[PDB]
Amino acid sequence: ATQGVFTLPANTRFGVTAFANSSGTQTVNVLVNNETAATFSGQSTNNAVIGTQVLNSGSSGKVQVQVSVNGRPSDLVSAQVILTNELNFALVGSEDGTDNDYNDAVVVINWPLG
Amino acid sequence: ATQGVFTLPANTRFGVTAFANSSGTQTVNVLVNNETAATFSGQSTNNAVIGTQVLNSGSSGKVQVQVSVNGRPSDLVSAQVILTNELNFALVGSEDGTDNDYNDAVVVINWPLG
Amino acid sequence: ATQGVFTLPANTRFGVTAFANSSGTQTVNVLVNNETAATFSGQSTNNAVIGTQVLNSGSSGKVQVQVSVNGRPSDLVSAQVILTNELNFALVGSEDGTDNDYNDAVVVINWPLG
Amino acid sequence: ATQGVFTLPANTRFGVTAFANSSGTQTVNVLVNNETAATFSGQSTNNAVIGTQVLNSGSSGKVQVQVSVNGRPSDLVSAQVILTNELNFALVGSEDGTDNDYNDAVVVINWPLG
Numbered sequence: 140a141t142q143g144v145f146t147l148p149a150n151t152r153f154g155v156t157a158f159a160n161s162s163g164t165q166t167v168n169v170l171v172n173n174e175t176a177a178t179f180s181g182q183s184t185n186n187a188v189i190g191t192q193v194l195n196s197g198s199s200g201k202v203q204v205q206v207s208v209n210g211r212p213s214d215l216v217s218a219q220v221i222l223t224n225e226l227n228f229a230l231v232g233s234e235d236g237t238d239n240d241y242n243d244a245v246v247v248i249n250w251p252l253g
Numbered sequence: 254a255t256q257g258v259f260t261l262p263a264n265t266r267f268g269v270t271a272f273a274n275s276s277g278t279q280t281v282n283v284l285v286n287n288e289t290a291a292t293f294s295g296q297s298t299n300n301a302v303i304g305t306q307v308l309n310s311g312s313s314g315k316v317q318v319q320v321s322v323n324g325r326p327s328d329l330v331s332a333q334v335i336l337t338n339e340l341n342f343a344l345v346g347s348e349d350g351t352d353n354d355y356n357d358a359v360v361v362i363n364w365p366l367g
Numbered sequence: 368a369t370q371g372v373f374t375l376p377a378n379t380r381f382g383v384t385a386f387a388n389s390s391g392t393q394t395v396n397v398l399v400n401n402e403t404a405a406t407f408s409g410q411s412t413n414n415a416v417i418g419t420q421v422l423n424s425g426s427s428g429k430v431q432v433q434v435s436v437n438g439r440p441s442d443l444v445s446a447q448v449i450l451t452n453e454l455n456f457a458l459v460g461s462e463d464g465t466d467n468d469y470n471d472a473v474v475v476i477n478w479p480l481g
Numbered sequence: 482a483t484q485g486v487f488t489l490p491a492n493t494r495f496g497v498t499a500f501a502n503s504s505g506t507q508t509v510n511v512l513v514n515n516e517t518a519a520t521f522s523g524q525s526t527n528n529a530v531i532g533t534q535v536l537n538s539g540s541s542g543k544v545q546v547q548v549s550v551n552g553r554p555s556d557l558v559s560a561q562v563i564l565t566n567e568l569n570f571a572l573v574g575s576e577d578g579t580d581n582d583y584n585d586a587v588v589v590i591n592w593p594l595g
């Protein structure tokens with residue numbers, strides 16, 4: 140199944156934050172309406188924050204996370220969770236190798252803000 | 254029900270990251286085995302990362318998040334989600350007022366690392 | 368924090384199914400737009416299905432689950448989880464006593480149907 | 482990533498319940514420690530509860546859900562969510578065709594029981 144794709148409420152600000160846990164340099168692209176809206180990159184084996192930004196979901200609300208390492212897309216896993224019918228998390232893990240820890244880039248999207 | 258309390262695997266590193274979305278200064282305390290192990294404070298209405306840290310869950314695995322604004326405890330919500338039977342997120346929202354957006358401090362705990 | 372309240376897309380059919388795990392008889396009420404739409408009753412300590420039904424979320428999309436045991440409101444826990452940006456679960460547990468297993472009535476709402 | 486595989490508490494009873502939403506007849510197989518422990522089947526476009534059973538997770542706790550329609554494996558999506566650090570849901574969706582509603586067989590595993 141498709142992973143890393145989320146429909147947010149239209150025209151809504153959201154946070155996006157990426158963490159790295161791998162030998163390899165992670166590039167995380169955040170798409171809004173099928174165009175790149177932000178790109179983060181970095182390398183850490185200690186969960187460093189490699190980027191964080193506030194974006195608008197735009198007219199369609201379609202947000203997609205893609206991760207590439209060493210020139211190839213990582214395999215993604217994702218889900219959305221909503222707490223007390225108010226607080227939204229869109230969560231992404233990714234695997235760049237063979238160990239299947241799925242933490243090589245971890246991406247957290249949260250909304251609403253403010 | 255109790256919120257903001259999670260049992261992690263023992264002696265395991267985890268990440269903890271706090272975001273703020275309120276006019277009030279947030280104080281986030283992260284307790285491991287009932288003792289404060291990290292503290293973050295700050296004011297943002299735009300999802301600032303008021304702190305991120307790597308901690309060790311220690312012998313007990315017990316991790317608790319508390320949030321307050323100038324000493325008044327915020328009301329918490331929380332849950333844990335596991336992706337592909339491997340990747341863990343422990344999620345906390347908090348409310349410091351009456352609007353019930355539950356984003357006033359947001360805390361994400363993730364493991365494994367590395 | 369309020370629990371057991373979910374906003375569904377408007378005018379959408381959804382399933383609601385309840386299970387019991389308690390010596391007490393569980394009564395589960397399901398409200399749509401603040402009006403009772405289904406009621407299930409039963410007793411089991413073996414996870415029996417005490418009711419299942421299909422409802423429509425109507426113009427507001429507001430769905431609420433309440434649980435009581437001999438008229439005493441149970442404390443609730445809840446969350447919503449969306450897989451592949453398509454499949455929705457609204458999940459409720461409830462506690463009628465002191466052991467805090469929160470399984471005394473378990474309610475699963477799922478959509479879309481069909 | 483692998484989907485539909487969950488590590489449960491060892492030696493512990495859990496509920497497993499399947500719902501159908503497709504023109505195709507669903508077959509759901511539940512494996513405990515790699516051996517078939519339950520099979521459910523039916524055909525509904527209105528969320529029929531085609532099976533529900535209590536199983537024991539056995540010595541290893543490994544539980545796997547597979548879904549097929551007329552002998553062809555469906556694509557699976559899954560996650561586990563934990564409420565108040567104790568109430569667990571392992572969730573599976575599946576797709577037998579091209580519309581990507583992932584509801585064609587829906588499986589919910591819940592524990593603890595009793």
Ligand SMILES: [C]OC(=O)C1=N[N]N([C]2O[C]([C][O])[C](O[C]3O[C]([C])[C]([O])[C]([O])[C]3[O])[C]([O])[C]2[N]C([C])=O)=[C]1
Nearest residue numbers: 253274275276277298348349350351352353354355357
């Ligand atoms: C006098 O005293 C004081 O200072 C005050 N008053 N009122 N207030 C309020 O509070 C609240 C709670 O905290 C707040 O809210 C917050 O923030 C906002 C922005 C949002 O975010 C929400 O959500 C939160 O909760 C408000 O703001 C305030 N107001 C004013 C006017 O300040 C305080």
Ligand SMILES: [C]OC(=O)C1=N[N]N([C]2O[C]([C][O])[C](O[C]3O[C]([C])[C]([O])[C]([O])[C]3[O])[C]([O])[C]2[N]C([C])=O)=[C]1
Nearest residue numbers: 388389390391412462463464465466467468469471595
């Ligand atoms: C006379 O009075 C009466 O009835 C009583 N007492 N006590 N009790 C109790 O309660 C409780 C609460 O509800 C119960 O718990 C329940 O169930 C069980 C089995 C389990 O499940 C739990 O979790 C729940 O919560 C109990 O059982 C009882 N006990 C007796 C002996 O009965 C009542």
Ligand SMILES: [C]OC(=O)C1=N[N]N([C]2O[C]([C][O])[C](O[C]3O[C]([C])[C]([O])[C]([O])[C]3[O])[C]([O])[C]2[N]C([C])=O)=[C]1
Nearest residue numbers: 481502503504505526576577578579580581582583585
């Ligand atoms: C002749 O051939 C046959 O058999 C067929 N064709 N087409 N089909 C289709 O398929 C599909 C897949 O499976 C189906 O889908 C299902 O169901 C529906 C109702 C819904 O639920 C969905 O989601 C699912 O997936 C369809 O139905 C069909 N169509 C017709 C018309 O049949 C088969």
Ligand SMILES: C[C@@H]1O[C@@H](O)[C@@H](O)[C@H](O)[C@@H]1O
Nearest residue numbers: 160161162236238240367
């Ligand atoms: C240090 C290692 O780097 C890459 O091989 C990752 O895929 C592994 O998960 C691990 O983080």
Ligand SMILES: [Ca+2]
Nearest residue numbers: 236239240241
């Ligand atoms: Ca890896």
Ligand SMILES: [Ca+2]
Nearest residue numbers: 160240243367
């Ligand atoms: Ca890694």
Ligand SMILES: [Ca+2]
Nearest residue numbers: 353354355357
């Ligand atoms: Ca607030």
Ligand SMILES: [Ca+2]
Nearest residue numbers: 253274354357
């Ligand atoms: Ca706020």
Ligand SMILES: [Ca+2]
Nearest residue numbers: 467468469471
């Ligand atoms: Ca109980």
Ligand SMILES: [Ca+2]
Nearest residue numbers: 388468471595
């Ligand atoms: Ca019980």
Ligand SMILES: [Ca+2]
Nearest residue numbers: 581582583585
């Ligand atoms: Ca389908």
Ligand SMILES: [Ca+2]
Nearest residue numbers: 481502582585
């Ligand atoms: Ca279907």
